[PDB]
Design a protein around this ligand. Structure first.
Ligand SMILES: [K+]
Ligand SMILES: [K+]
Ligand SMILES: [Mg+2]
Ligand SMILES: [Mg+2]
Ligand SMILES: [Mg+2]
Ligand SMILES: [Mg+2]
Ligand SMILES: [Mg+2]
Ligand SMILES: [Mg+2]
Ligand SMILES: [Mg+2]
Ligand SMILES: [Mg+2]
Ligand SMILES: [Mg+2]
Ligand SMILES: [Mg+2]
Ligand SMILES: [Mg+2]
Ligand SMILES: [Mg+2]
Ligand SMILES: [Mg+2]
Ligand SMILES: [Mg+2]
Ligand SMILES: [Mg+2]
Ligand SMILES: [Mg+2]
Ligand SMILES: [Mg+2]
Ligand SMILES: [Mg+2]
Lengths: 140, 197, 132, 325, 567, 49, 235, 101
RNA sequence: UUGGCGGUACUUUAUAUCCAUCUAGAGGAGCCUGUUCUAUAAUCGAUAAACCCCGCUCUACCUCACCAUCUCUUGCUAAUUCAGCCUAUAUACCGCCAUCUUCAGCAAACCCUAAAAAGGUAUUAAAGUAAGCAAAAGAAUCAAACAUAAAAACGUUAGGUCAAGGUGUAGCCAAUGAAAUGGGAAGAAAUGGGCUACAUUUUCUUAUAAAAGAACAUUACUAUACCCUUUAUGAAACUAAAGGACUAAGGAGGAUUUAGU
């Protein structure tokens, strides 16, 4: 828009509660896809998004898995003649560190809502909390 | 009854200094009439060039990132900063975290495509605590290590409690915390039969 | 001789699209997949239900747009959203397409209990990759 | 009466429009990616297209492309005659006006040199351009006999006395030959906390992988996976394989090796260590010796690996019994 | 973060060149066809529910399940009547209520009130629906009200509201009198309906009528009932009848609204504007200034739906700006529309196109051409597809700014919006282009535009059996061809004056002659004489003599020219 | 649910919102076969009494 | 089941048995052969046996300024629309059998003497509408091949002329008869003799000749004598 | 309509095994142990036998959902080898390709 | 004249292949399994090369399509004088394949011939030419190469498959359709493939394939048979596994033949 621009855009209401926040020591995001190029583009979007919000991120590529199975090519007899099929799974692991519970929800929503078709995520949150108050003091 | 005629593509009216994020606000399929790029895709025929964007099923088959561009992502995260909260500065190291927060609770989420959001693996929870963090007498630590069996790792001195028996994650989480309390309190208790070791 | 999904040679007068020209061994090499979901990835469930839904969704669109489909449809699943991307010939009047889009979306959203959207790109005529 | 799509020959106005659309495309692609249009380059274009249109097709000719029209559109021979219909070139009716125009020039040069009347190896390590390269220069298609005749005529030119004009001419049809360097790449020499020198190298035999850490000074103490080599390798043939690198260079009892081999069987693990030690031992030997090792098989990775089984037959090559008739 | 895409149609419309609405009629037709397809699917889903019953969605989605609207409770009990009332069936509920009375089974007063609510609100008529109303003295609602053994305040109140909704003002007032005699107390909603009744009724004396409505307000304080926003909005909407005498009363209400603590909404200002700025206002000499104060009051505020006339405000505010010819005020009104999410209260289809049409027309008239083109690209087509008169205003603005080089471009845009065959627009484009002389490059560009507008006339002629080429377009298209290196085409167009029997103008005839002199073609010069003879124009003879002196005529030409001179 | 698919699509074909090329093919083969006199006999009136 | 239903293209391909082996080797005395039909020819989108009326699909979306709603035709009205469609369906079928007569040649079952039209336009739009083509012989010769055994080609002899002195002949061979007609017709236009006619109706003098073992004895005749010659010579 | 009468019988077998799953579990639990008197186990051995034969879950056969083929089916997609190859060879299965290696 | 043939010559030749060369096998013994035959009240199809652990990555009921007995007649669907049919024809077909084959050709548009049934090359060139499919290239086995896979046109064998599904023609419709219960046997006879053993480069035990201690011909080597127990799955053991005994035959297999670079 050249001349016609919003004046005071409405922004969502964020209210700070009195409950303490979760503390995630680690947060591993394992994305899976049949296509390597899609993971490269998603890895760029996720690393850029993390860096813009202040999150610390690292990336590595777990070894790919190829599952192969054999089928019978003909409809009837001709046993020795087969057709083989495979499904390839490729992985990109985004290991985040030192996240509060509010930072991990907004980030995961933003990147989960933009998860391309054919891509599956496996978030593995690792929370750190104090000891139970009963355990803190031995009681007989 | 004259046939309807298609308008010229709107890319023709697009300036080179436009606000592209506005053109592709959200994930959409590739629209050759809205993408102002002479992109070509397709294995070319001999003495031929790759196919053009209009009527290109291959470009439609791609999960494009037009909505997610470096300009959009930076403008998006600028809005999303208000949501984030600051990590406590004091916990600048992993060792510092173990001192004040010795208990590590592992929970897993799964995101897939389908009508149902249910995955059986989301109920499982895993608690990890180091016995050094627990206040254990020489008697207690030996009793704690014998009861837990293979859950304790001598090399790392970490006790691992994995709870998936309960249906929900809030139940499995509360159960592992319960298992720790009983094991700790039981370890301190001394039974008469223990003197016969 | 192999017959699967192979449009055979005649006398150089048979138009074939890019999708039809390429035999099965070019899948993942020269041409991609028409459906993209997460159900065939490793350690994923509900492959059978995604595959059955696709078979129906393709027969539904063929009958609902009889003679108006220039090429096979592309199905894209994100979260619980379904997206159908079809190349459609410009045969029908414009207002008729608006009727069939509203109808096909509402009907398939109340049948599979997911949000279904239809994306139509109109071509002047079928695009010919090569004459074989 | 054949009805197939004709060649869509590209006129100059067509390609000119394809270059204006590309020039407007770059300004849009630059605006999308937030880069400066003036400096945006072909390399940046390919990177931007790969992000915005991720494709995982194995063949890269089938992937999305936004290239300058010159790269994609095949450059075609233009019209060979004017509006009046008179061909532009006097050799038009031969059908190979460019091949025969070149054979006309070289035959006229040969005649002047022969009429008018030193070492001919002005250029060394060069080859004659291949037929595919010549065809591109002439912008037309040649036969094998057409290529062979062109070379025989060019060879005759070199035989004769050649002024600097001839040498420059034949040069245009000579392509520089690059002789691949089949020589070993020496490893670095790191230093330990104690200060001893040592080099490291990896080795792979079958499915086994090894990481040796040869030390410059030692008494011949080889430890595999924190164990001695007599204990780890109870078979003589495996120990002999570890002896080959040092024995060959008469360096037995002069180095201390620490190995870490994981994967494979007993023989594949000894072979993997042998290569890893030979590559690490390169840093402590003269270049003449490194070539001596290469010519003895010590530095070449063995490519022989287990072959896959094929459906319809007993083994990788073993076929099911042909049933009696 | 994202803003409106200026080069795209509204998101509702399908993003394909074949499927983009060219005209405003197609915009409504395309959406109505979409709504029709949605209703065709909902009909099938609600008529064959057994095929739409398997639920595979976790979490469960209630809004994607088949609906059931017919009562499934067969037994005749107070509970069964309550179900029908919940489903809002009017006739079935009356039958089961009467059957319950026939048996004599007890019915709760609250349940009997739920029946009256349904009957009173729908006025005894089944709810309107699509598938393959004054108050009636003898009706179920009034009958059931009498049969009621025990009455409560709500029962009377429901009758008063339903009567007023269905234009039973006189009866509703009588029912209220009964409520007072029973010593019951009404609610705010009932007081609002009663005020709506006194206003709609025509009272001979306004002073009496106004004092009556105030009496209803005074009884709202006696009964400890506090007014709401709708109460004041209802009073102001009634006052719009008496523009002259409602000004002082109307302002007093708004001051009382703030003191009470009720916040004026967009609807409340919509009514004050109507009352102070009449559309049929003869006294335009000295208009009121209240509109300026209102916009200052609402500057930067965000508004939400709180009344049924909130949408009307913006369309009315822009209209008042156009009447006053104040473009500064128009920016304030549009600026308010952009704050927050005020855009949602612009109006519906009838009022959305009036606001922007009024807005853009004011911009073109009173704004610099440079800015006028910025607004043009933003609003069109993204916001609204304009009618042809909008383009005539834009072309006139270009003429006033001495920037006619853009007139060809405006034509190309007009063709997308279904103005290709508009006679009024085509006559304006050619007129401005050919009104005065121009440099050679500009004339060549105008000639190409003139050629395109000629094809529209040509194609229309071929398709239609009976076609008339209007005289003025013929002159403009011919002049432009001569001036822009298309003289050969202009000579062919000279014959079209005779084919359609249009009288060539004196200016055009002499222009053709001037070009002929430069060309030096006597033959072409005589061609002009031929057409002049056809229409018996007096100047034709003078033109023939002019040719005699301009060019050397061959003896054959002398005989041919002499014949035409005689003719 | 093979009954839901077959019944639902059949109802849509009768409402004019779906076109079954397979059914239209079979419907015309029955029409031609009946004209040839090879149509389905009525129940209880078969060749065998 | 709804999932065992195939498309029309696949149904007709199988039922017609065109690609089947038997047809390729010509092992049937073709008769009563199935004829392909398009079933979507007269079907309008939005029209069903139940007769429902769908605004925006099969009926006007707005009528006389009123936004239409869903409706259904009465049993009588639907029986009329159904009847009208049957009439159109039958009308097309009768037209399929209707044909336009073409003059026979020397005999009813022979190609000799049959006009096949003018030759095709030339390289630079050189039309030959003034030329007529006639067939003089159609032969089914055979070449024995290892792959195909007896293989058959169509050898056609044609003559062309403009009726004004210019005429020519050529032979065209192909595997398909239609192709042999095109090859011979366009080849003969490249071999146009010009024949001298006395006064435009006869030869200048008697002509006796032997070509190989064929003898021809032509005689010049007066006007009104007509052509009294071999049928090929008359053509 | 299901593909054939064999698929119809299987569907009923699958719907009657679901109804009798809890019952056949509770009764069969009394038999799969050594802690209860053998008289009770012999009586539970007959209560399970008396249940209808179609409740028995070993009488279910996995058939191609589209062609009702009893053998050749792939359990992950519930399709026969012939039907699977038609969808895979046309690019209609998401991520399935031919195996070249 | 073309093709096919020749106990007609003269040259190339095959690359785990025609001969020679090399290694381990089949052919003999015992078992497992297919087929044929016999045979049963009791499926079907494949059945030289290109069937014979083949459709089955699989039959106790189910599966099942077979036999016997009993039963149902608008009998899965929204509607239908309709539903349904594993009924006949793969010699009506689609679909999906085998085979020559990793063979080098196929088809189409032109052009030429003292006529052409056909044929159309010479490179120091003499009538052939310009494009498609196959091959090639490319991609896959996640550096590189090689290799392996994949790929392989048009035709040949009316090759295989109406029983994957669909479908043309003909046939059944109180039955050739639907459902229930119980059965679907048997060889030991020929033959195909496989497994195991016949041992000393072996047998058992601990380790780990290093080394050591025993065993080593009458029962030593040596049964995945029969039989006898226990366990697993199941409602059902008729199935599988693990032990126990019990032993038989087997002493490196005629003609001939399979595979491997
Ligand atoms: K076949
Ligand atoms: K046997
Ligand atoms: Mg082997
Ligand atoms: Mg006859
Ligand atoms: Mg059937
Ligand atoms: Mg089973
Ligand atoms: Mg051999
Ligand atoms: Mg044997
Ligand atoms: Mg057979
Ligand atoms: Mg059975
Ligand atoms: Mg049975
Ligand atoms: Mg039967
Ligand atoms: Mg056959
Ligand atoms: Mg290849
Ligand atoms: Mg046969
Ligand atoms: Mg059948
Ligand atoms: Mg059969
Ligand atoms: Mg040993
Ligand atoms: Mg023994
Ligand atoms: Mg048991």
């Amino acid at each position: 828009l050249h001349v016609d621009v919003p004046k005071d855009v409405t922004r969502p209401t964020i209210t700070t509660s009195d409950e303490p926040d979760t503390l995630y020591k680690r947060l591993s995001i394992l994305v899976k896809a049949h296509d390597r190029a899609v993971l490269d583009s998603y890895e760029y979007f996720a690393v850029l998004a993390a860096k813009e919000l202040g999150i610390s991120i690292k990336v590595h590529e777990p070894p790919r898995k190829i599952e192969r199975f054999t089928l019978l090519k003909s409809v009837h007899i001709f046993k020795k003649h087969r057709v083989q099929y495979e499904m390839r799974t490729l992985y990109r692991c985004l290991e985040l560190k030192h996240l509060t519970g509010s930072t991990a929800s907004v980030y995961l929503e933003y990147i989960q809502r933009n998860l391309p078709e054919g891509v599956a995520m496996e978030v593995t949150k690792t929370q750190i909390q104090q000891l139970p108050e009963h355990i803190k003091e031995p009681m007989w | 009854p004259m046939r309807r005629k298609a308008l010229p593509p709107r890319t023709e009216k697009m300036d080179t200094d436009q606000d592209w994020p506005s053109v592709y606000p959200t994930a959409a399929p590739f629209k050759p009439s809205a993408v102002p790029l002479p992109v070509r895709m397709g294995y070319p025929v001999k003495k031929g060039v790759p196919m053009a964007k209009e009527g290109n099923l291959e470009l439609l088959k791609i999960p494009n990132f037009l909505h997610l561009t470096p300009v959009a992502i930076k403008r998006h995260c600028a809005a999303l900063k208000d949501f984030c909260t600051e990590w406590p500065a004091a916990l600048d190291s992993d060792e510092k975290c173990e001192e004040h927060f010795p208990v590590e609770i592992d929970t897993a989420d799964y995101v897939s495509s389908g009508p149902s959001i249910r995955n059986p693996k989301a109920r499982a929870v895993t608690l990890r605590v180091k016995l050094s963090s627990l206040n254990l007498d020489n008697h207690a630590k030996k009793k704690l290590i014998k009861l837990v069996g293979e859950r304790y790792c001598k090399a790392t001195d970490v006790l691992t409690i994995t709870t998936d028996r309960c249906p929900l994650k809030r139940q499995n989480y509360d159960y592992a915390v319960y298992l720790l309390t009983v094991l700790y309190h039981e370890s301190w208790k001394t039974e008469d039969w223990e003197n016969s070791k | 001789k192999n017959r699967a999904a192979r449009v055979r040679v005649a006398k150089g007068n048979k138009p074939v699209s890019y999708e039809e020209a390429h035999a099965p061994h070019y899948i993942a090499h020269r041409k991609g997949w028409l459906s993209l979901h997460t159900g065939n990835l490793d350690g994923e469930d509900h492959a059978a239900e995604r595959t059955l839904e696709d078979v129906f969704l393709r027969k539904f669109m063929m009958g609902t747009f009889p003679g108006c489909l220039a090429d096979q449809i592309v199905l894209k699943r994100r979260a619980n959203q379904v997206d159908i991307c079809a190349l459609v010939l410009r045969q029908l009047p414009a207002h008729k397409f608006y009727f069939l889009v509203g109808y096909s979306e509402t009907l398939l959203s109340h049948f599979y209990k997911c949000p279904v959207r239809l994306h139509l790109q109109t071509v002047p005529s079928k695009v010919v990759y090569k004459y074989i | 009466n054949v009805q197939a799509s004709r060649q869509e020959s590209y006129t100059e106005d067509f390609i000119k429009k394809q270059i204006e659309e590309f020039n407007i495309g770059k300004r849009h692609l630059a605006n999308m990616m937030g880069e400066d249009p003036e400096t945006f380059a072909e390399e940046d274009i390919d990177r931007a297209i790969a992000y915005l249109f991720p494709s995982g097709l194995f063949e890269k000719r089938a992937r999305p492309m936004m290239k300058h029209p010159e790269h994609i559109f095949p450059k075609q021979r233009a019209t060979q005659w004017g509006e009046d219909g008179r061909p532009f070139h006097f050799l038009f009716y031969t059908g190979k006006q460019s091949y025969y125009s070149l054979m006309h020039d070289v035959y006229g040069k040969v005649m002047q040199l022969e009429k008018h009347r030193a070492e001919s190896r002005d250029l060394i390590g060069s080859r004659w351009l291949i037929k595919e390269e010549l065809e591109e220069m002439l912008v037309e298609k040649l036969s094998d006999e057409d290529y062979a005749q062109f070379i025989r005529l060019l060879e005759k030119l070199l035989t004769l006395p050649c002024g600097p004009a001839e040498e420059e001419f034949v040069q245009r049809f000579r392509r520089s030959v690059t002789i691949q360097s089949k020589k070993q790449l020496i490893e670095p020499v790191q230093y330990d906390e104690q200060g001893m020198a040592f080099s490291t190298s990896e080795g792979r035999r079958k499915s086994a992988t090894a990481q040796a850490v040869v030390y410059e000074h030692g008494s011949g103490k080889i430890h595999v996976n924190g164990v001695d080599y007599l204990i780890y390798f109870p078979i003589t043939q495996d120990r002999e394989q570890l002896m080959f690198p040092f024995h060959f260079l008469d360096r037995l009892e002069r180095h201390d090796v620490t190995c870490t081999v994981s994967g494979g069987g007993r023989s594949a693990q000894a072979g993997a260590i042998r290569l890893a030690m030979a590559r690490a031992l390169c840093s402590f030997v003269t270049e003449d010796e490194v070539e001596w090792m290469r010519q003895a098989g010590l530095l070449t990775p063995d490519p022989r690996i287990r072959e896959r089984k094929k459906p319809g037959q007993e083994g990788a090559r073993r076929k099911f019994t042909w049933k009696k008739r | 973060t994202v803003n409106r895409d200026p080069t795209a149609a509204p998101y509702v419309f399908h993003d394909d060149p074949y499927l983009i609405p060219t005209s405003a009629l197609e915009s409504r037709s395309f959406l109505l066809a979409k709504k029709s397809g949605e209703t065709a699917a909902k009909f099938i889903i609600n008529s064959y529910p057994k095929y739409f019953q398997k639920d595979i969605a976790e979490p469960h989605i209630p809004c994607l399940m088949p609906e059931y609207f017919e009562p499934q409770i067969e037994d005749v009990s107070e509970a069964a009547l309550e179900e029908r009332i919940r489903l809002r069936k009017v006739r079935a509920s009356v039958d089961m209520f009467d059957q319950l009375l026939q048996a004599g089974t007890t019915v709760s007063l609250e349940t009997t009130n739920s029946l009256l609510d349904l009957l009173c609100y729908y006025g005894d008529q089944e709810p309107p629906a699509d598938y393959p109303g004054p108050w009636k003295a003898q009706n179920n609602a009034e009958r059931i009200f009498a049969l009621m053994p025990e009455k409560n305040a709500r029962s009377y109140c429901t009758m008063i509201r339903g009567m007023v909704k269905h234009r039973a003002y006189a009866q509703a007032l009588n029912v209220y009198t009964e409520l007072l005699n029973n010593r019951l107390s009404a609610d705010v909603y009932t007081f609002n309906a009663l005020i709506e009744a006194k206003t709609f009724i025509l009272n001979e004396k306004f002073e009496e009528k106004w004092n009556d409505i105030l009496d209803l307000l005074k009884h709202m304080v006696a009964q400890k009932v506090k007014p709401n926003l709708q109460t004041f909005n209802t009073i102001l909407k009634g006052l719009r009848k008496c523009y002259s005498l409602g000004r002082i009363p109307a302002l007093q209400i708004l001051r009382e609204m703030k003191h009470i603590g009720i916040e004026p909404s967009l609807a409340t200002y919509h009514h004050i504007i109507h009352l102070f700025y009449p559309r049929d206002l003869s006294a335009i000499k000295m208009p009121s200034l209240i509109i300026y104060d209102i916009m200052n009051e609402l500057e930067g505020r965000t508004f939400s739906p709180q009344d049924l006339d909130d949408g009307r405000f913006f369309q009315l505010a822009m209209s008042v700006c156009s009447s006053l010819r104040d473009l500064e005020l128009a920016y304030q009104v549009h600026r308010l529309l952009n704050t927050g999410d005020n855009r949602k209260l612009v109006g519906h289809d009838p009022l959305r196109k009036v606001y922007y049409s009024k807005f853009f027309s004011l911009i073109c008239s009173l704004e610099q051409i440079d800015v006028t083109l910025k607004w043009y690209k933003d609003l069109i087509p993204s916001v609204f597809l304009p009618h042809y008169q909008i383009f005539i205003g834009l072309l006139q603005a270009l003429d006033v700014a001495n920037r006619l080089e853009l007139v060809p471009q405006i034509w190309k845009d007009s063709k997308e919006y279904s103005h290709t065959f508009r006679d009024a627009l085509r006559e304006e484009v050619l007129m401005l282009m050919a009104r005065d002389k121009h440099p050679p490059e500009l004339q060549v560009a105008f000639a190409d535009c003139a050629a395109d507008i000629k094809s529209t006339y040509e194609d229309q002629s071929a398709r239609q059996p009976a076609f008339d080429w209007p005289a003025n377009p013929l002159q403009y298209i011919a002049v432009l061809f001569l001036r822009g290196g298309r003289s050969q085409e202009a000579w062919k167009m000279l014959e079209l004056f005779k084919k359609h029997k249009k009288i060539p103008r004196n200016e055009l005839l002499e222009e053709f002659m001037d070009t002929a002199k430069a060309s030096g073609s006597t033959a072409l010069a005589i061609e002009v004489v031929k057409l002049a003879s056809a229409f018996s124009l007096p100047i034709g003879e003078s033109l023939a003599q002019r040719v005699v002196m301009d060019f050397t005529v061959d003896p054959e030409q002398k005989e041919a020219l002499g014949n035409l001179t005689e003719l | 649910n093979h009954n839901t698919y077959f019944a639902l699509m059949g109802n849509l074909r009768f409402l004019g919102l779906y076109r079954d090329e397979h059914q239209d093919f079979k419907d015309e083969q029955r029409r031609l076969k009946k004209l040839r006199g090879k149509g389905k006999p009525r129940k209880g009136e078969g060749k065998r009494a | 089941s709804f999932f065992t239903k195939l498309t029309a293209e696949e149904l007709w391909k199988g039922a017609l048995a065109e690609t089947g082996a038997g047809a390729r080797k010509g092992r049937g005395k073709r008769t009563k052969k199935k004829k392909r039909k398009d079933l979507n020819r007269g079907q309008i989108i939005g029209e069903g046996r139940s007769g429902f009326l769908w605004p925006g699909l099969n009926v006007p979306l707005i009528k006389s300024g009123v936004v239409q709603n869903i409706g259904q035709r009465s049993k009588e009205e639907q029986q009329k629309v159904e009847a009208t469609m049957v009439e159109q369906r039958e009308e097309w079928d009768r037209k399929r059998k209707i044909k336009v007569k073409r003059e026979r040649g020397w005999s009813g079952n022979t190609w000799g003497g049959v006009s096949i039209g003018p030759p095709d336009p030339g390289p630079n739009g050189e039309t030959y509408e003034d030329f007529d083509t006639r067939i003089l012989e159609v032969r089914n010769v055979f070449n024995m091949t290892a792959k195909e055994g007896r293989k058959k080609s169509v050898r056609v002899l044609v003559a062309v002329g403009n009726g004004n002195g210019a005429a020519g002949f050529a032979i065209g061979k192909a595997a398909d008869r239609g192709d042999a007609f095109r090859k011979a017709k366009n080849r003969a236009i490249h071999y146009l003799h010009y024949i001298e006619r006395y006064e435009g109706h006869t030869i200048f003098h008697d002509i006796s000749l032997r070509f190989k073992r064929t003898q021809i004895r032509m005689k010049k005749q007066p006007r009104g004598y007509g052509l009294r010659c071999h049928r090929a010579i008359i053509t | 309509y299901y593909v054939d009468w064999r698929m119809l019988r299987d569907l009923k077998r699958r719907k009657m095994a679901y109804e009798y799953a809890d019952e056949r579990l509770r009764i069969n639990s009394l038999r799969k142990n050594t802690i209860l008197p053998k008289d009770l186990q012999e009586m539970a051995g007959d209560e399970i036998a008396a249940l209808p034969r179609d409740s028995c879950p070993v009488r279910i056969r996995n058939r191609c959902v589209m062609t009702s083929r009893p053998r050749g089916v792939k359990r992950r997609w519930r399709l026969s080898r012939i039907v699977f190859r038609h969808l895979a060879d046309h690019g209609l299965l998401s991520g399935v390709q031919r195996a070249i290696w």
